[PDB]
Amino acid sequence: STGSATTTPIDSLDDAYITPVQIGTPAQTLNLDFDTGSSDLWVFSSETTASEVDGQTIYTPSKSTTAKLLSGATWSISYGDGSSSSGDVYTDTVSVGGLTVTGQAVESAKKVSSSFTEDSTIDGLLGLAFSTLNTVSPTQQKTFFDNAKASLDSPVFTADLGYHAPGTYNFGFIDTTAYTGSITYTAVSTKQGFWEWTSTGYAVGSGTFKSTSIDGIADTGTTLLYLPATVVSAYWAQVSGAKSSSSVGGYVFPCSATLPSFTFGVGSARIVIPGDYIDFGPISTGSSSCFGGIQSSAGIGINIFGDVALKAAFVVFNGATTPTLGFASK
Numbered sequence: 561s562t563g564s565a566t567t568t569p570i571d572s573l574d575d576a577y578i579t580p581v582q583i584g585t586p587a588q589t590l591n592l593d594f595d596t597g598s599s600d601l602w603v604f605s606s607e608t609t610a611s612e613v614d615g616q617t618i619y620t621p622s623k624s625t626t627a628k629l630l631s632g633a634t635w636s637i638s639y640g641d642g643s644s645s646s647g648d649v650y651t652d653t654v655s656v657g658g659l660t661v662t663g664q665a666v667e668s669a670k671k672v673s674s675s676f677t678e679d680s681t682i683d684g685l686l687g688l689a690f691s692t693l694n695t696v697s698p699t700q701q702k703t704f705f706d707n708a709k710a711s712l713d714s715p716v717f718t719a720d721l722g723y724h725a726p727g728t729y730n731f732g733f734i735d736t737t738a739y740t741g742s743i744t745y746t747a748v749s750t751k752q753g754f755w756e757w758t759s760t761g762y763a764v765g766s767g768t769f770k771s772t773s774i775d776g777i778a779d780t781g782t783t784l785l786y787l788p789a790t791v792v793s794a795y796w797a798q799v800s801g802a803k804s805s806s807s808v809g810g811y812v813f814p815c816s817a818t819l820p821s822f823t824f825g826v827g828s829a830r831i832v833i834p835g836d837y838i839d840f841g842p843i844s845t846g847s848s849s850c851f852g853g854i855q856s857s858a859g860i861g862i863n864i865f866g867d868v869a870l871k872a873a874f875v876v877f878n879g880a881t882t883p884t885l886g887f888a889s890k
């Protein structure tokens with residue numbers, strides 16, 4: 561089997577992407593944030609505290625003929641941005657892009673933090689990291705990908721995120737029409753439960769490539785590119801008037817600037833992030849200070865190849881017995 565679903569930016573900045581997901585019988589379609597940096601499929605629901613719901617579509621298990629309480633199971637998760645959610649668990653039928661899993665753990669939120677409530681466009685998350693990170697207790701649950709894997713034509717999914725445009729998540733096949741040149745594959749460590757890999761270096765604009773190992777994770781659920789402070793300083797030094805602002809919480813730059821590209825290495829291959837991808841617009845409405853899309857990972861404890869980086873590539877998440885990542889230009 562295969563599946564193919566379109567993923568759509570939630571706003572004009574590509575702050576996140578949503579993908580429609582069918583849950584239950586008859587189907588309830590919720591727009592989920594596919595997150596290769598976490599391993600829980602959780603939803604706004606009929607159980608979510610009413611004051612914490614503001615415009616999201618909810619899953620109502622009592623209206624699904626295939627929903628079953630997973631008795632005694634609870635979940636609770638905290639993300640890198642400080643947001644959180646928790647609740648109980650149902651099993652139900654979940655379909656993505658025509659690919660169906662029966663018996664998927666659907667984590668029903670009883671509580672969500674303010675950042676979730678305030679984002680009316682995201683109805684929950686669908687985690688695509690390794691199932692070792694799943695938070696369900698006392699019986700840890702599998703991701704949608706891990707449950708689908710054995711049925712797929714190939715044990716893979718691909719992320720093809722758009723810049724200010726829709727893109728695609730495919731399951732079970734490589735679309736050889738969706739990228740240019742060849743796919744370069746690189747090793748993955750699953751020791752921390754992430755799609756963790758090592759970039760071979762970077763360049764700023766038309767500058768020379770610096771060969772250096774940068775360990776980090778491929779994380780579709782993170783907006784920005786978070787890299788070591790040395791790398792980030794080297795980037796922003798090429799933008800007149802850019803500075804790190806402790807008041808704003810990262811590098812800012814004059815909205816009048818033209819940003820340089822940023823290149824990262826994948827083995828001997830190179831992915832180029834156009835400068836435009838690094839502009840996250842005014843820090844507050846009408847400001848002439850703009851927020852940068854490349855930020856320091858110092859204090860976060862890991863480097864994160866988030867959407868700024870991933871949307872410059874066609875990315876293969878190879879879930880074979882020995883997982884690997886692939887990157888192609890597009």
Ligand code: NA
Pocket residue numbers: none
């Ligand atoms: Na922000």
